[PDB]
């Protein structure tokens, strides 16, 4: 799965007055990395990040001022940009604008074109904003491309410098017996402490995967340690436990786990 960098920039208005404050959330490989305001960036010094992201914040304050808006109280405008680097070293891009938490405008690198949702309030917001950018040549094709190119340079800079909040962690596996009743037993196979999220876990009778319906399935739960845990159980006759193994694929590692005793 790809390396990614996301910039989530929010500006706010109270009764059509745009607030001085804005905030940029930066996420690296899906992880909260930096929170940035007008003054400073903070991790979980950051001088080059504060310069770049203060620029975009001001452009976005100006953009919210050009939004015609009968409704009073609180409104928010967000610019959300992501770049991705994949296995094959191919890259992806997205660049989206949200008003009061709803999409109204995207820019598409491949076509160099705006896209709008079908809603008519989406189309009004979008034209308020596009017409503002055109009058002043404020956000041109070239500006959109350059923001994407900086996104990729910064992601590469973070990767080159070993801010790589990512490594494989194979599961710990434990098989247990339970509900020993009416000459039946539940066999439970637990995978814990694992990263990444993607896992295959299955009971087999004589090395053949049981159907989904004859098995019971944990969700995949966050540990609170950055990792995941899940499980699968099935109901067998006492005396037959030799015929049942837990099969697991994680991260190129195919392993098999019998019922103990």
């Amino acid at each position: 799965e790809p390396h990614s960098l996301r910039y989530n920039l929010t500006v706010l208005s109270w009764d059509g007055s745009v607030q001085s404050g804005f905030l940029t959330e930066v996420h690296l490989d899906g992880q909260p990395f930096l929170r940035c305001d007008r003054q400073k960036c903070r991790a979980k010094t950051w001088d080059r990040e504060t310069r770049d992201l203060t620029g975009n914040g001001k452009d976005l304050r100006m953009t919210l001022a050009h939004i015609k808006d009968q409704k009073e109280g609180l409104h928010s405008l967000q610019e959300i940009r992501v770049c991705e680097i994949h296995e094959d070293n191919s890259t992806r891009s997205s660049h989206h604008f949200y008003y009061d938490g709803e999409l109204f405008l995207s820019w598409n690198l491949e076509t160099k074109e705006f896209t709008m949702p079908q809603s008519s309030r989406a189309q009004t917001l979008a034209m308020n904003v596009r017409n503002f950018w055109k009058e002043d040549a404020m956000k041109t094709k070239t500006h959109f491309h350059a923001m994407h190119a900086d996104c990729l340079q910064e992601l590469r800079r973070y990767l080159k410098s070993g801010v790589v909040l990512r490594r494989t962690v194979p599961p710990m596996v434990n098989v247990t017996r339970s509900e020993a009743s009416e000459g039946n037993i539940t066999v439970t196979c637990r995978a814990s402490g694992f990263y990444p999220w993607n896992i295959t876990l299955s009971w087999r009778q004589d090395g053949v995967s049981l159907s989904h319906d004859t098995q019971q399935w944990g969700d995949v739960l966050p540990d609170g340690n950055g990792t995941y845990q899940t499980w699968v159980a099935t109901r067998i006759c006492q005396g037959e436990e030799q015929r049942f193994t837990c099969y697991m694929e994680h991260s190129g590692n195919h392993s098999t786990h019998p019922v103990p005793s």
Binding site: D15, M62, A65, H66, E135, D136
Partner: protein, 124 residues
């Protein structure tokens, strides 16, 4: 002439106007005081032709434009009137001061909000 000025030693000269840009965020009052301390005032916009370089300013910066609610009009710090067909004024934040932005825009901002600022010498 091949010559522009006279201007302070390390200021930007254009059509015999002198300008400087300050990256140290200050509110409108401190910005004006800073410009006057350097024998200048906050940017005054008087001519799209003479100050056409203002087209190429990135972002928004304090200029010398202030609202007095009694007369119900915008004017420069030197008490001269905003000439018509120079600036489009846009309500951004509630306030009585204005930020310059390309192209010949003024964004209404709270006077107390720190911002970067542009000084222009009074040869006015």
């Amino acid at each position: 002439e091949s010559y522009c000025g006279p201007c302070p030693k390390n200021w930007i000269c254009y059509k015999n106007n002198c300008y400087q840009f300050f990256d140290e965020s200050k509110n409108w009052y401190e910005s004006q005081a800073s410009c006057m301390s350097q024998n200048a005032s906050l940017l005054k916009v008087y001519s799209k032709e003479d100050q056409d370089l203002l087209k190429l300013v990135k972002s928004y910066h304090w200029m010398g434009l202030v609202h007095i609610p009694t007369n119900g009009s915008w004017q420069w710090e030197d008490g001269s009137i905003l000439s018509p067909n120079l600036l489009t004024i846009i309500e951004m934040q509630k306030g009585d001061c204005a930020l310059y932005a390309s192209s010949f825009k003024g964004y209404i901002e709270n006077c107390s909000t720190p911002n970067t600022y542009i000084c222009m010498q009074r040869t006015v």
